[PDB]
Structures are given as C-alpha cells and as structure tokens.
Design a protein around this ligand. Sequence first.
Ligand SMILES: [Ca+2]
Length: 448
Amino acid sequence: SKDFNNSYGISHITRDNMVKIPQQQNSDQFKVPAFDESTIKNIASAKGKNASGNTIDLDVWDSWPLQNADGTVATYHGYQIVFALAGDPKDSNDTSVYLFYKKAGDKSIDSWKNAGRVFKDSDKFVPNDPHLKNQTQEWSGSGTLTKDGKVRLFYTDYSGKQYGKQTLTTAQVNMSQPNDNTLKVDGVEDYKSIFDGDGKIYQTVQQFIDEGGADTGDNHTLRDPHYIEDNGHKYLVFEANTGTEDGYQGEDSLYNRAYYGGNNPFFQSEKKKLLEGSNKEKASLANGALGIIELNDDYTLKKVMKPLITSNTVTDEIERANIFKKDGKWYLFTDSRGSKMTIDGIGQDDVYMLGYVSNTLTGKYKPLNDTGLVLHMDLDPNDKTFTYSHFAVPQTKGDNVVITSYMTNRGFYEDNHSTFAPSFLVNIDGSKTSVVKDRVLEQGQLTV
Ligand SMILES: [Ca+2]
C-alpha cells in the first residue's frame, strides 16, 4: 500500500510524543516561571537611531551570549557579551544585531551597556560575496570566543527582496577598549557567506518558490546557526527544512510511519484524520529540521551533513537550534510555536522548548521527559510578561542550566519595550529535566 516506514537514518519528533504533551504540560516541572510584573524594566542602554535619524528606545528581541567552544559563557577582558536583535517597531520589518556588554561583577539590567550595532549599513556591500549585498535583515545565530581570543559571530543573512532567502553568515567582530570600563566595536572582517541550502539534504529558497510556497503557506527556513566543537571538529547547528532525499515535504510524508511513532492503530487513526481535515496541506508542508554542517578552520563550509532531527508532519518551524555536551551526553533543544503545529490538544497560545538526548553528536536523539517537552509558555501575547526565544545556557559547574528569553513587555504603562526577560534555572538529570522552583534570576542573567 501507500503506507511505508522511512527514518532516513535520522531522529524524528514523532506525532505520538506530541499528542501526549497536552495532558503532561500542566505542571511546574515544565511551566515557565511566573515573573513579577512590577520589577520588569527596559534595557536602559537600548537607545538607538530610527530610520528617520531620531534617537529612540529600541525593542530588544532574540539574544545570545558570547560563548566558549563547549557552550559556557565566555569572559572577554572581564566582560560578558550578549548579541541581540533590536530595532524600531515603527519600521516593523527591521532587525539589526547589537552588542551588549556587562562587567562580570555587576548583576542588574541597568549594568548592561550598549556598544551599538555590530555592522554598519555599509558592511554588507564591502566583501566579495554571492549573497551579502542582497541582505534586508540581520537574524539570529551564535557567538564564539576563539582560541586566538577573537570575537567570532555567526548570524543569519535574511533577504526579503529575494523571496526570504536565508544564508548562514560569519564575521570576526573587532573590539577595543577606549577606556577601563568601555568596549567599542571597531568594525568587521572575514565577513562572508557559508551555506544557504543544497537541495538534497536541506531545502533551498528556489525549491520553496518552485513549489508555489508564497501561496501554499509553506515556511522556508535556514537560520539560527549555533557553533559547537567536538573531537577537534567545528560545527554549526541550525534551523532548516528537509531536502528532496532525506524526507521531503508533500502528501507522501503523511504515510510515513517514522513521523508518527506509537502503534499501528494510532498511525491509521491519526493519518486518516490528517488526510481528511483542513490541516492536510499544513501537515504535508511541515518538514522542519535541525541541520548540522562541518566548518573549516577559516570558517568556510567543509561538509554538508544529514540533519540531527526532523519535525515532518508536526511543524515547519523548529527555532533557536541549541546543542551542548553534558555528563558525556549530547543535549539538543528547539523552540516551537503551537500555532505552527498540527497536533490535537496544542493551540495558538502554546509555546514550547523541546529537548533531546544522544550518546553521540550525530547519534539517535531520544526525547527528554518521555515526550520531548522541557518548557511550556502559554501566556497571551498581550500579557506584559510574555516570553519567547527560550535558550538553555550551560554552566561551568552544577546540573542546572540558565534559561534566557526576551520579554515583549507590551504593557499599557511604562516600562513598555521588548527587553531581557528574568532568567531562571532548569535541572538536567539523564533524560529528565525540571524547572527549579522559585529561583527567578535577574533580567538577562547569564551565569550563577
Ligand atoms: Ca516546508
């Protein structure tokens, strides 16, 4: 029959595990901590110039810290460094990477100083690159402190003028200290594209267009590159979509048992509901993946590898790829919107962080807490303490990881700008994770 089973040698976020989350999620083991609304403040240094030229308060969104190769928070001349997407909502479609810095001793949100944008509007047109001159927006990624002590950035080149073309891009961020308490962005070098999809392993923007993606409601992604090191090799783990040969999108995917899990009755019943319903196209187009590529020492592409995990039929969008080694095991994390998912019981308000454990970097990834659920955030987008872009930050010692996120902060009264959310702790024990109760940290805190 049309029924088949194709794993493609890779792990999968299965429908059976996802349908079990609703009846599991209502627990303080998974619930994102309730944040105290009165103590929420804007980032004081989040000042910037709008597209008009006037100085205004910026909305600060997705943020990532400068990391050591193993994932721990780096120390740069006595400073912790955070890269963050920021911009003016009055110019809705614009995100630029800003550099925030804080002395290691300081703790408050007021202590975070702003070095400004990493790139000038001119920087993208300087080097000889096949993609950079088409960039409309700067999107998320990662930052690593090299063995040479250089600030190495990885981010996403987004092109709105090229049908939403997303390219994994790198640059060395040249720094200086004008005084004893100030970091300055001097400029950038080694600014170049690395990877934008191959077609077979990861979907290109051309295939998106060619299948009529702009009308069908397809979501093309190739973003959020996260740097990691293992056995002397250098990798980027990133949000992507499957190519033609590792489980492509389309109707046939709904017949693939590997994406369902569970028993045959579950497969037959879940498939039947999916083929009949209004979620048929949505599930068919859903082919999210967490991809991995190896890099050369100069940070160019070395090898395009098969994905670590896919979310075929489940969702087309698995965001903020995160990976780190702990207790000899490899942990993989992803943020997911319930509004993008096709699962019964999961709704528009549900926002998740999912987690997976493997014995090797490229081995079989098994779901944490049985289902993959690690964090559940279901606060209305209108709430002041709404949080998004949850990211697990590994620590030097202890079993706890620090969770960072941005708080939209859209209240009717001041303060009212998207800011650093208060951080919190999550305990990791084997294939089990739990939120540490009543340990709410300072806004944008990286370490404990
Ligand atoms: Ca897709």
